Every structure is written in C-alpha cells, then in structure tokens.
Q: What sequence folds into this?
C-alpha cells in the first residue's frame, strides 16, 4: 500500500531500459509474484489489504511500457532473461475482465493551440461562459455558507474582490477568462468542432451540477478535456520542477495513470463544462476491446499475422536452401521468447474464466464475449497451420508450441466457436477437423515426416480436444454436421489401421486406442447402433435431409459410410469368446494391441441414455440406440484379466498391466455384486495362493533373484487388480455393514493375509516400492474417487475393509491376543499363539463391565443378520485371531 | 455426507487437524432465512442414521448417549438490550472525571 510511490518512481526509468534499470525490474518481478491477490479487481486477502482503484492501471501502464520497449529492441539474452518472467507475473497479477478501473522520465506534451487562429463566431457563448465560471464560483460560496464580501479583506477565506455587478470592476474579469480561453482554444485545436444547432444567444439561479449521466462519446469528450487539463498542468508544474534535478511531484503522473480520487479536481470541471454545453445544445462532431481479455489478443492478432508470414518465408527459404541473414530475425525470436511463455502462462492462470459463460456456473466471472474466445479459436487454427506439417520446421520451441496449443485446447465452449460466431472461424475450425482426419487417413493407408508431425502435434492435441469436449459434455454442440462427418471418417480411419500387423505401428497403437476412446466418449450419435441411428437427432441422416445428404453423398446408414466398426451385438460376444479362448498375449500378439485399444474405446460405455436410466436423448429418440444392460462385458473383462495374467505371469506385460489397471473405470455404475463376488474371490484367491509360495521360497533361500522376479510380477498384479476391487466395495460396503455378507468377511481375510504377507516380506515391500517407481503407479489416484509413498494399496485396502472385519466380532479378547502378538516379538511363535487361542475362551467380555457395552451389544444383537455361529466356541477364536493378526500388522505399519 | 466422508481437494479425510483442545467444544448450527433443519445429538441410537455406516466401529460415541433428559440448547435472540460498555472495547472509552 505504501510502495505505490516507489512504483511511480520506477515507471519513470524502468521502461526506458537503461543499464542499471534491470535490477529494479527484478524487484518488481518479486514484488509482483508476491501480493498477487492484493493486486486484483476483487479483494485478495487482509494480510496487506486490497489494491487501490488505480494501482491496477499503474501495473497495466507498466506492462504496456515494458512491452513496447521490448518490441524492436536489441536481442541480447541476459538483457531480458530475467524480464520475460516479469511479463508473465505482471500479466498474471491483474484480471482480464474489466482490467482497469476508471481508465483515462515522463514529459506531458501540451496541445499547440496558440499558433492556430481561434474562431470568434460564438463569442456570445465564449464570454458568457467565461463570466459564468466566476459566477458559479460565487454560487459555491453560498452553499459553503460564506457571504461574499465587497472590499478586499484577508479574514474572508473566499476571494474578497467579488462585488455586486453594479460596483464590480472588470479588471479581474478580463484576466480570469484566460483559463477558459485556453480550454476553448484546446477544444478548437482538437478534431472536435462546435456547431450552433439551436437558435439563441451576484448569484446564478440556474445550477451547474455534474451529477447526471450522459452518453458514452459525449462523456469521452469531458474525459479527454480533463486529460488535456491535467497534461497542461503537469507541463506547467514540471517547468518549475525541472530546476531541482532530483525527485518528482506525486501528481506529475499522466492523466490516465493518476488515481481516480485526485482525478475529481479536473473531472468535475470537465463535466460542468460538458453540462453547460448540453444546456446550450451545441453539436459536436470529430467493452471487451478495452479489457486485457481481448485487446491484448487483438495485438496478438497483429503479431501472429507477421508470425505466419515470416515463418512461411522461413519454410520457403529452407526448402530452397537457406538465407544468410534473416530480414527480421529479432522479431523472429521475439515470439519464441515472449509470446509462447506469455500465452502458456496467462491462459493457464486465467483458464478458470475462459471457459466460463453467464450460462455456465463457475466461480470466476465469465468473459461474456464471443470474439474474446473466438479469436482464440482462430489462434487454434492459425497455430495449427503455423506447425501444420511444419512442427520440426517451426524450431526447437515446437514442444513449447505444442504445449501452448495444448493449454489453448483447455477452455473451449461451442457457444463461442460453433453455436455462435462468424462463419470464417467456424469454417476454419471445420477445415482443421477435415485436414486432421485426412492426414490420419493418409497415415493409416501409408502404414497399411507426415507421420512424425501427426504423432507429435496432431494426435496429443486432438486427444485433448476430445477429452475436453467429453468432460464438458459439449459433444452434441461441437460434433455435428461437418464436424460429425469428420469424426466419422477419423473414427473409421483409426480402426482401419487395426488390420495392419506391422512392427513400427506397435508403439503407436496405445495412442490411437486412447484417442479412439476419447472420441467414443464424446460421440453423440451412438454410431455403434447403425440400425437405430435414425431415432437420434444428432445423426447426419436425421439432422440433414437426403437433399442435404446428397452434396456429400451420404449413404443410408452410418455403417454404410464405413462399416469398419462392427455392430455391438456380436462384437462384445466376439471379444468375450476370443480373449477367453486364447488367454495369452504371445499366442495372438496382434489382437492384444488391436482389439484391446478398441476395448478401451468401449470402456466409456454409457448406460444413462438407455433402458436402465431415463435417457436425456429420449425426447429426441424414443427407441434410444443404447440398449445394453447386462455387465457381461465387465465380467468377461475380469475373466480375460485372470486368464491372461495367470498364463503370462512371467511375461513383462507391465505396460499393458498399467493400462488394464486404469481400464474399466465405470465398474460401480454397472456393478453386479453376485458375479463380482463369483469372480473376485477366485481371482484374489489364486493371487494370494501363489503369493504364499513366493514368500515361502524367499524365506527358504534367505536362510534370491528367482523370488525377486516372483515378487516383481506379484507387485505387478496387485497394483493391476487392487484398484478395481476398491471401487467395487466402496459402494457395496455400506450394504454389507447394514446386513452381514459371508463373502464380505471372507474377502477381509484375503486382503488381510496379503497385507500381513507384505509386512513379513521385506523385499516384497521393496518390490512393491520398485513397481511404484518402475511403473509410475498413481496410487493416490486409486485413493481419490473422481465421482516410501506411505499410500500403497495393500495398506489402503485394510483402511477400506476394516469395518467389515471389525463388526463381526463382539468379544474384546483382542487385547489378550494383542499381548500374544507382542509375545511374537518376545519369542512366542505360531504354536505358542495357538496355545493362547486354546486358553482364550476362559476370558471373555461382559455387557455389565462398561455402560457403553450395553448399547454396543444392543446394536450388535439388533443387527438383522447377526448369528451365534461366530459366538460358538469354535469360531470365536478363529475370528478374533484373524482380527488380531490384521490389527497387528496395521499397528506396526502405523508406528513410524 | 450420507455415510460417505467428504473429500478435500488435497486428499485428506480430516476437514481440520492440529486442533488444540483449549477450553472445550460444543455442537453448533446456524440457519439462514426461511430454513429448517433437524439436529440429532444421539440420545436414541435407533434414531441415528448412518452411525453404523460410519462411527460405530471407529470408536465414536453419539453425543449425549446415556443422558436421561434431552440436552438444553441456547439460541441467539435478536432483541436489542442495554448492556454496560466493556473496558476493552477497541473503539470507545469512558472516563470518570
């Protein structure tokens, strides 16, 4: 708050960019990284308060001065290495929407008006207003509660020279009109003229009050008049101030830069003159644009036009050799060092509101301007064209360029690109879609450098566009008409390459599968049902009449354009048969990398628009295309997982293991607990079954490389199967807590046994951590439901399943068993704790021991599924031993 | 919420942590204009929902479980009244000359 004077001193010399002006720019950089919310249109925080009404505009003027000094300046690296992050921080330190409040060394240039001959055709107004200024000065005194004294006296605080007009001397009237004469000459010198539209021409009865509003242009008249007043005042003050040679007046700052609180001195006079002109009736004749939101993007346009033309020149000369000296090499590197960091920082920082609209419900205020986002869309198309087949040609900043294009892909709504906006940019983005799909077709027919350009720039960014549209639920509003046709042909081109069995395509198949899955999620016609596509309104045949389908030769069905995608009726059965039958990657390596990608495409299988749940598209189509209910797909997935893992345990399938762990995310919505039990218990039971030997072989050898390999695949299978089991019971535990399920407690024992095996086996902990870092496991992702690490799944699964194993045991003998488990470390083995199990039954808890025990036992016996089978002497020891052991290893994990 | 622990952005189950005990804690609730709400301290366990889902096996007891009579509650009445000027009031001071 008290550094605004320091900033006012810094703006005098910092934009000049002297030799010693760089460190102050670094100080600005740090001071601007700090207090970041304090400078903002809303209130940041109370640690230092809120910014003034104009210090934001001081920052804005700083940014523009530094930017213009940057432009066409010497290209020295250290000259601006520290200063480009300063531009990033300054741009991020102020909001784009309503960037400046009350918008509109340093030498205030006056207006040369004495040279020109002034008009005198309106002297009846000139002299009248010149006298009226002093008349209103008198009028202010009666409101101030002071009488006007005739004779000159010092005690009268107002001007004592004032008198009644009968005894008033004009010697002061002929000298007080000089400021009025100067102001009128200033207006005359300005491009704005005065025309007598109307026919006309010591206290004034008519009042001159500036409390009423007026039109924007006519208010800009008064704003510019006050600007001229203040720059003339600054010039006449700095004429005297320049003799000092050091320091400056705090109000010497330009009219736009000074604070609005001190602007009133000139604003009130300008508005009073404006209201006088309005009363006369004289004719005067000469939003998002003013904001940081879009004006800076206007200058971006004025930059990227030059950018595209010079990179076209560069690619032309690199094709026809090279140029010894680039005509504008400084401007060539300018964008690469400034624009790319500035775009990828600024849009990153304010992307919260860039995808916000008044229709949308978001925290940051929406831009509410079609051009604001649509020239951004043009920038998508243009930047694509800047690197279209020229990614390697663009330069070493191509990874930077594609990252900028990626963060651009963030924050896009169809309400600004397709549903509204000029047809030029709409056709540009549609042409981008057509070009990308055509390039994909050419790559997949060649594979049956352009491919390098596609795989580096087009495929990742296209994946991001599809993911963003799918998450924003803009598929219906984006994928339609030409866009939907392009989606059709790129869809059928991606799967067309699936028939290829080459070697160089194997690495690309995961990316194609991911992009195909992304498009499948945001695909709003449900192409998988060709026989029912006529019901959905998003279909090109339903949306466009056959006359509208003739120009592009649309066949009758979506399958007829490209039957590459099989129908859903048999394809699910096809995979559920072939994958079960083969049960090995090596036997059929082609389908493992071809059908599994389209299986990941089928992963976002939605059933909220089918018979299961009321379809949002049901009014559009009464028989909705989605007509799949059973989770046969999911249970076939689980069976395939079991078969392939068990058969190829030794095979280093860790990458596909990771894709399979992240695979089948919407299990809960289609989770059928019966079949899920029937598949999870046998699966995790073979898993822990071989886990028993793996630690056993480790134990015998330790009292090695073979067992470490066994733990390697074991640690692989856990992190590849544990994530899917968590989500299944996250939403089914509540039912089993409410009503005890026999399988639920059994699975508690399974996960407990695997966990305790992990706690016994030091290298199994080692290899678990190894596969955390070898496979880059996102275990925190498994914990967080979208709806060394000390966050492994083997510990997580008990934090998850412990209530199931804890609500089955009423007696509190676990304390004496806990003593036995401490005796484990005190040299009591499994046989000794079996003896303690034998002697446990002579000590049990009582309902009368504690008052809380009464209601605890009340709830325990009021559970509808409670039974005395566990309370029988044979089963009590078993259940309490299981709980005690799992609790053992949980506490020893808990102890650091 | 409905037996499911609310999730923080960072990924912590505890809404607050490192809380000093100090002098003590009490249940509290505030309602806006035209709002109604049902506060269940837990005098009857049969009337407590989702307590078995979360809290029962974690060692959490219902507030006022063994209490014979319902817990008395205090509400902030909005009737202005005259009270002595506190000596530590930051804005006003009274001197006895």
A:
């Amino acid at each position: 708050s008290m550094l605004q004077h320091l900033l006012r001193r810094l703006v005098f010399d910092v934009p000049i960019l002297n030799e010693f002006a760089k460190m102050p720019l670094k100080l600005l950089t740090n001071h601007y990284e700090r207090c970041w919310k304090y400078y903002c249109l809303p209130t940041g925080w109370a640690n230092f308060g809120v910014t003034s009404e104009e210090e934001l505009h001081l920052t804005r003027k700083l940014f523009w001065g530094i930017f213009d000094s940057l432009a066409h300046k010497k290209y020295d690296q250290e000259l601006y290495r520290m200063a480009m992050p300063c531009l990033c921080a300054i741009a991020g330190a102020l909001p784009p929407d309503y960037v400046d409040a009350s918008y509109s060394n340093f030498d205030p240039r006056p207006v040369e008006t004495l040279n020109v001959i002034i008009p005198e055709k309106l002297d009846s107004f000139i002299n009248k207003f010149a006298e009226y200024t002093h008349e209103k000065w008198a009028f202010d005194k009666i409101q101030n509660n002071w009488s006007y004294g005739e004779n000159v006296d010092e005690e009268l605080k107002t001007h004592p020279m004032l008198r009644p007009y009968k005894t008033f001397s004009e010697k002061d009237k002929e000298i007080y009109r000089w400021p009025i004469k100067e102001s009128l000459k200033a207006m005359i010198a300005w491009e704005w003229t005065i025309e007598k539209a109307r026919e006309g021409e010591y206290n004034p009865q008519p009042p001159d009050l500036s409390g009423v509003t007026l039109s924007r242009e006519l208010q800009a008249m008064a704003e510019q008049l006050a600007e001229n007043y203040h720059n003339t005042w600054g010039r006449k003050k700095k004429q005297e101030l320049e003799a000092k040679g050091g320091g400056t007046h705090p109000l010497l700052v330009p009219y736009d830069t000074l604070t609005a609180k001190e602007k009133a001195r000139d604003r009130e006079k300008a508005q009073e003159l404006l209201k006088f002109l309005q009363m006369n009736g004289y004719a005067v004749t000469r939003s998002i644009e003013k904001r940081f939101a879009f004006g800076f993007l206007q200058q971006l346009l004025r930059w990227m036009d030059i950018s595209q033309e010079f990179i076209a020149h560069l690619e032309a000369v690199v094709s026809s050799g090279r140029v010894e000296k680039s005509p504008h090499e400084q401007e060539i590197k300018f964008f690469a060092k400034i624009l790319l960091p500035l775009i990828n920082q600024y849009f990153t920082n304010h992307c919260l509101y860039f995808l916000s609209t008044p229709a949308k419900v978001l925290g940051s205020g929406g831009h509410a301007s079609n051009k604001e986002k649509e020239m951004i869309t043009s920038l998508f198309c243009k930047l694509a064209a800047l690197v279209r087949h020229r990614v390697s040609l663009f330069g070493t900043d191509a990874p930077a360029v594609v990252n900028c294009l990626h963060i651009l892909a963030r924050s896009l709504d169809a309400r600004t690109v397709m549903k509204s906006g000029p047809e030029i940019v709409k056709a540009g983005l549609r042409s981008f879609f057509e070009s990308a799909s055509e390039d994909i077709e050419k790559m997949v027919e060649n594979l049956r450098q352009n491919l390098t350009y596609t795989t580096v720039a087009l495929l990742p960014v296209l994946t991001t566009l599809f993911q963003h549209i799918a998450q924003h639920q803009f598929g219906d509003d984006v994928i339609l008409d030409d866009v939907q046709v392009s989606c059709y042909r790129t869809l059928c081109s991606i799967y067309s390459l699936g028939t290829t069995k080459n070697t160089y395509v194997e690495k690309l198949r995961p990316a194609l599968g991911e992009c195909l899955a992304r498009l499948a999620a945001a695909m709003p016609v449900a192409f998988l049902e060709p026989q029912l596509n006529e019901y959905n309104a998003c279909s090109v045949y339903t949306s466009k009449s056959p006359r509208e389908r003739a120009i592009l030769g649309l066949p009758n069905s979506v399958e007829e354009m490209c039957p590459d995608i099989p129908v859903l009726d048999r394809l699910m059965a096809d995979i559920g048969g072939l994958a079960e039958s083969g049960a090995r990657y090596t036997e059929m390596p082609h389908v493992i990398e071809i059908t599994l990608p389209m299986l990941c495409s089928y992963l976002p299988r939605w059933w909220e628009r089918g018979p299961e749940a009321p379809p949002p598209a049901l009014p559009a189509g009464a028989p909705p295309p989605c007509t799949a209910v059973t989770s046969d797909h999911l249970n076939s997935l689980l069976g395939n997982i079991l078969r392939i893992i068990v058969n190829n345990l030794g095979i280093d399938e860790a990458t596909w293991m990771k894709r399979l762990a992240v695979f089948a995310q919407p299990i809960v919505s289609r989770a059928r607990p019966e079949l899920l039990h029937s598949h999870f218990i046998p699966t995790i039971g073979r898993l822990r079954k071989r886990a028993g030997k793996v630690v056993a072989e480790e134990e015998q050898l330790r009292l090695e490389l073979l067992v470490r390999d066994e733990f390697s695949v074991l640690c692989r299978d856990l992190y590849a199967l544990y994530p899917l089991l968590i989500r299944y019971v996250d939403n089914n535990r509540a039912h089993w807590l409410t009503e005890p399920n026999a399988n639920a407690e059994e699975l508690f024992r399974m996960v407990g046994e695997i966990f305790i095996y992990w706690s016994k086996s030091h290298n199994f902990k080692r290899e678990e951590q190894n596969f955390v870092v070898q496979n880059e496991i996102n275990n925190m992702s498994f914990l967080t439901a979208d709806s060394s690490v000390q966050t492994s799944l083997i510990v997580a699964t008990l934090k998850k399943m412990l209530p199931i194993g804890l609500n089955m045991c009423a007696p509190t003998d676990q304390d004496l068993i806990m003593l036995a488990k401490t005796r484990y470390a005190l040299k009591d083995t499994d046989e000794e704790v079996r003896e303690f199990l034998q002697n446990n039954l002579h000590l049990q808890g009582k309902v009368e021991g504690s008052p809380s025990l009464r209601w605890q036992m009340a709830l325990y016996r009021g559970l509808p599924g409670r039974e005395e089978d566990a309370d029988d002497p044979e089963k009590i020891v078993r259940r309490v031993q299981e709980v005690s052991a799992v609790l053992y290893h949980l506490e020893q994990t808990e102890h650091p | 919420l409905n037996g499911e622990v609310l999730m923080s952005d960072s990924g912590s189950e505890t809404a607050f942590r490192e809380i000093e005990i100090g002098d003590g804690f009490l249940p509290v609730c505030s309602l806006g204009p035209g709002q109604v709400g049902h506060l269940n301290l837990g005098q009857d366990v049969s009337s407590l929902r989702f307590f078995a889902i979360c809290g029962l096996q974690e060692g959490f007891e219902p507030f006022a479980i063994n209490m014979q009579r319902p817990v008395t509650t205090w509400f902030s009445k909005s009737l202005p009244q005259f009270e002595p000027v506190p000596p530590e009031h930051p804005h006003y001071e009274v001197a006895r000359m």
